[PDB]
Specification:
The structure is a homodimer of 115-residue chains.
Chain A (H helix, E strand, L loop, with lengths): L6 H6 L7 E4 L3 E5 L7 E7 L14 H17 L6 E7 H4 L8 E5 L9
Antiparallel strand pairs in A: 1-2, 2-3, 3-5, 4-5
Bound molecules: 8-bromo-adenosine-5'-monophosphate (2 copies).
C-alpha cells in the first residue's frame, strides 16, 4: 500500500473519496472536511513522510513544492486578499494525522496568535 | 542593498541587531520580538521574495529549505513535544512585513483554529 497507511494514504490510493482540487505526480490537494475558514484545503505529498521532524534533507524540494501548489490553488480559488499556511507538528502542534500535510486557509481575516 | 528594503533586509545586512540562532548561505533564523509562544522564531531567506504569491517555481528548494532549517532549529531549542509552522500571506493572512518568512512556534499547546 503506497502513500502510507493513514487516512491520507487511503485518499491517495482513491480508496476513500475526496474533493480533489489539484493533483500532479508529486502531491495532491483537497478540501478539508472540517473547514476553519471559508476556503480551507490541504496539500499532501504522495510520498509518505510521517511528520516534518522526519523529513530528510533530500525532501527539501518536495516540501517547497507543497507551498508552490498551495499558492497556485489558492489563486485558483480566488484568494486575492491572502491566506495563511500551517503545518502542524506533533502533540503541541496539534497533529492528529501522521502524514505530512499543509493547511491553506483563507476567505476571512486570520487572527493572531495563530492558535 | 541586498536582502531587499524591509525590516528583515536590515537584519540580513546586520544593520539592526537580532538574536541569530542559525545562519547559512541561504537563510537566517532569529527569535521573534513579540513571541506568541514560549519559543517563537522566524526563518527568512536572504533572497528577497516579497510574499509567497510572488515565489517562482525555481524558488521551490529555497522554500523547502526554510522548513528543514525550522525543523533543525526547533530541535536545537528543545521542542520535543512539537510545534506549528506558519506563513502569512497578504492582508487576510496578517502579513505586515513584505519579505517571505516562516514562523515556528512551540513550547505550549497550540490551539485550533490557527487564528
Ligand atoms: N477524509 C478527510 N478529508 C478531508 N480532510 C480531512 C479528512 N480526514 C481528516 Br482527519 N481531515 C482533516 O485533516 C486535518 C488534520 O490536520 P492536523 O493533523 O494538522 O490536525 C483536520 O483539519 C481534518 O478536518
Ligand atoms: N526586528 C525584529 N526582530 C524580530 N522579529 C521582528 C522584528 N520586527 C518585526 Br515586525 N518582528 C516580527 O515580525 C513578525 C511579522 O510577521 P507577519 O508579517 O507574518 O505578521 C511579527 O511576529 C513581529 O513580532
Amino acid at each position: 500500500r503506497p502513500g502510507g497507511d493513514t487516512i491520507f494514504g487511503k485518499i491517495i490510493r482513491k480508496e476513500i473519496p475526496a474533493k480533489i482540487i489539484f493533483e500532479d505526480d508529486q502531491c495532491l490537494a483537497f478540501h478539508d472536511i472540517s473547514p476553519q475558514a471559508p476556503t480551507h484545503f490541504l496539500v499532501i505529498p504522495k510520498k509518505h513522510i510521517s511528520q516534518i521532524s522526519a523529513a530528510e534533507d533530500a525532501d527539501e524540494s518536495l516540501l517547497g513544492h507543497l507551498m508552490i501548489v498551495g499558492k497556485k490553488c489558492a489563486a485558483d480559488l480566488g484568494l486575492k486578499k491572502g491566506y495563511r499556511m500551517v503545518v502542524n507538528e506533533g502533540s503541541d502542534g496539534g497533529q492528529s494525522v501522521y502524514h505530512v500535510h499543509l493547511h491553506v486557509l483563507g476567505g476571512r481575516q486570520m487572527n493572531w496568535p495563530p492558535g
